[PDB]
């Protein structure tokens, strides 16, 4: 049990501030409030929430899922809180190791030169637009698709 009530126990998930720092960050009112919050997962991506975020008793294990080429923040709509509460708020999503498949061998294409030839970045940009997100970047070296949302 984490002194701030945060529930985050799955392998490779981490927070900024770290879960250890957050355990030392409970205030006089028993709350853990940060300015700028990241939840990440090594090998998959991360999500950055600007501004003041109340983390106390946040069930991150249930709420946040950072997968290959996709994040899920609130698995259903019934338990998604009102706009501005919890993590239903503006965020920058980064999904790492996102690379296309080479139709010849069904092998991943990681060469930046090849990724440019085929304008993969514009596939991800089209996808963002269709999802109602704002495309920010595709960094081919790390396969990092970055986009911003106003809420989840």
């Amino acid at each position, epitope marked *: 049990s984490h002194p701030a009530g945060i529930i985050l126990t799955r392998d490779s998930y981490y927070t900024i501030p770290s879960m250890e720092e957050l355990a030392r960050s409970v205030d006089e009112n028993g709350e853990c409030i940060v300015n700028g919050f990241t939840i990440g997962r090594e090998g998959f991506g991360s999500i950055y929430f600007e501004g003041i975020v109340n983390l106390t008793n946040l069930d991150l294990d*249930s709420i946040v899922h950072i997968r290959r080429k996709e994040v899920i923040v609130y698995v259903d709509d019934q338990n998604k809180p009102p706009l501005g509460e919890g993590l239903n708020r503006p965020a920058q999503v980064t999904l790492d190791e996102v690379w296309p498949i080479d139709k010849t061998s069904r092998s991943m294409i990681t060469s930046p030169e090849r990724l440019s030839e085929m304008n993969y970045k514009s596939k991800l940009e089209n996808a963002s637009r269709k999802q109602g997100a704002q495309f920010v970047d595709y960094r081919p070296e790390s396969g990092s698709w970055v986009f911003k949302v106003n809420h989840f």
Partner: nanobody, 126 residues
Framework: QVQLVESGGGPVEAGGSLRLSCAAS????????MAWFRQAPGKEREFLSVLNWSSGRTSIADSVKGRFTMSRDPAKITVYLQMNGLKPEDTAVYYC???????????????????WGQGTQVTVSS
């Protein structure tokens, strides 16, 4: 100062069902944890169920797992205890409890919750 108001108790035939309600008010509960407990005469308070407000996830004590479930109406900031297959030993005062704080206690511990309802009597008549 937070107010927790239980309702829905009272007499019920054995084998029947009851739904308890608890309306919470006074502050935002967006980062809360809420629980149901009960206390029979001459016994310590018993943990029944907890709900995490941020996700809506719940956990039920083994003593009542398969018979009791916990849910909420987020809009009404109300939680519910659905009790089925009621038995005479379910007779008790049922309490809703809440925390808007972190804690060193586990969620099944009454000390986890700074706020408590007045309690509502449930009486299962054979």
């Amino acid at each position: 100062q937070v107010q927790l108001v239980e309702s829905g108790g009272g007499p019920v035939e054995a084998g029947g069902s009851l739904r308890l309600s608890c309306a919470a008010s006074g502050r935002s509960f967006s980062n809360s944890v809420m629980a149901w407990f009960r206390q029979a005469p001459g016994k310590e308070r018993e943990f029944l169920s907890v709900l995490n407000w941020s996700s809506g996830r719940t956990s039920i004590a083994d003593s009542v797992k398969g018979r009791f479930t916990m849910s909420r109406d987020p809009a009404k900031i109300t939680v519910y205890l659905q009790m089925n297959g009621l038995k005479p030993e379910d007779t008790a005062v049922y309490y809703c409890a809440a925390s808007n704080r972190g804690s060193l206690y586990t969620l099944d511990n009454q000390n986890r919750y700074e706020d408590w309802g007045q309690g509502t009597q449930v009486t299962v008549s054979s």
